[PDB]
Design a protein around this ligand. Structure first.
Ligand SMILES: CC(C)NC[C@H](O)COc1ccc(S(N)(=O)=O)cc1
Ligand SMILES: CC(C)NC[C@H](O)COc1ccc(S(N)(=O)=O)cc1
Ligand SMILES: CC(C)NC[C@H](O)COc1ccc(S(N)(=O)=O)cc1
Ligand SMILES: CC(C)NC[C@H](O)COc1ccc(S(N)(=O)=O)cc1
Ligand SMILES: [Zn+2]
Length: 257
């Protein structure tokens, strides 16, 4: 199956997922001098106060913190979006070293990691229907750099020991994702795709300009996770990022001057 190794990584994905070479693939490089300020872009509305987290899962490619998305409890609206998008999960992509790990890049700069808060459009009823639509998902992407610790991340870091290997899960209730946001909500936005198979072209990407800082100890604990299942030869879960894809016939818009 697909992965991030030499024999199943991003250069192989097109053989089972031909949309890998499609017209609106993600991630991309964000050329800050080419992105156009769009004064018609509305401010983002992040309403996470009623969020209900449930569980954290090692799925063999990353770890997902999952939410109750059966009601409008934690939603994203505004910005480039029409309608209401419900938070279903967040996850990260990260590197084996601090100089790499993010999926999007900014003027070719790579950050140490990237957080993805995944939301689906409520007019399609459920997540599986939404991923079949060009405006079905909105993913809020947030860069991580290494510096001071992020206090709101520590609860996640401290549970990773219990989900070391693929298929393990743990209860993860009462987690507040507001503690993972930077101060500013200035953003870039463009139409794109899931960055892992099935690579569906269903995502409005909203990438925040301001990174969050995490400590070296926090990201070191990400790197102790395993791609493999329990009892299998250990493969550290590192460098689970897809590189930048061709922008093709797309414009990146900026919410800020
Ligand atoms: C785990 C054992 C069966 N070995 C796996 C097997 O060789 C499959 O190899 C592959 C290699 C690449 C892919 S793709 N186009 O999804 O990235 C799929 C299967
Ligand atoms: C009805 C409520 C409790 N929520 C149910 C909703 O279908 C959420 O289901 C989920 C939530 C997250 C995921 S994962 N590991 O892909 O991120 C999968 C199914
Ligand atoms: C209506 C809500 C609760 N749906 C979102 C929820 O997370 C369900 O997630 C999913 C996940 C997968 C599918 S499938 N295998 O049909 O594509 C459908 C819904
Ligand atoms: C096809 C459906 C039902 N299952 C999809 C699967 O859960 C993958 O979901 C996702 C969700 C988000 C992303 S990312 N890295 O772009 O934010 C990638 C895969
Ligand atoms: Zn992701």
């Amino acid at each position: 199956h697909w992965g991030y190794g030499k024999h199943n990584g991003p250069e192989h994905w097109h053989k089972d997922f031909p949309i890998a070479k499609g017209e609106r693939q993600s991630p991309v490089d964000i050329d800050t001098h080419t992105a156009k300020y769009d004064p018609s872009l509305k401010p983002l509305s992040v309403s996470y106060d009623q969020a209900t987290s449930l569980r954290i899962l090692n799925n063999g490619h990353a770890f997902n913190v999952e939410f109750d998305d059966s009601q409008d409890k934690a939603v994203l609206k505004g910005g480039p979006l029409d309608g209401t998008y419900r938070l279903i999960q967040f996850h990260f992509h990260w590197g084996s070293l601090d100089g790499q790990g993010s999926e999007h890049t900014v003027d070719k700069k790579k950050y140490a990691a990237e957080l993805h808060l995944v939301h689906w459009n409520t007019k399609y009823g459920d997540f599986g229907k939404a991923v079949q639509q060009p405006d079905g998902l909105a993913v809020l992407g947030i860069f991580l750099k290494v510096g001071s610790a992020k206090p709101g991340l520590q609860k996640v870091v401290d549970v990773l020991d219990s989900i070391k290997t693929k298929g393990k899960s743990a209860d993860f209730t009462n987690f507040d994702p507001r503690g993972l946001l930077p101060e500013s909500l200035d953003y870039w936005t463009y139409p794109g795709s899931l960055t892992t198979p099935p690579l569906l072209e269903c995502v409005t990407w909203i990438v925040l300009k301001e990174p969050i800082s995490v400590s070296s100890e926090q990201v070191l604990k990400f790197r102790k996770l395993n791609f493999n299942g329990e009892g299998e030869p250990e493969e550290l879960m590192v460098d689970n990022w897809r590189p930048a894809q061709p922008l093709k016939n797309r414009q990146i818009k900026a919410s800020f001057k």
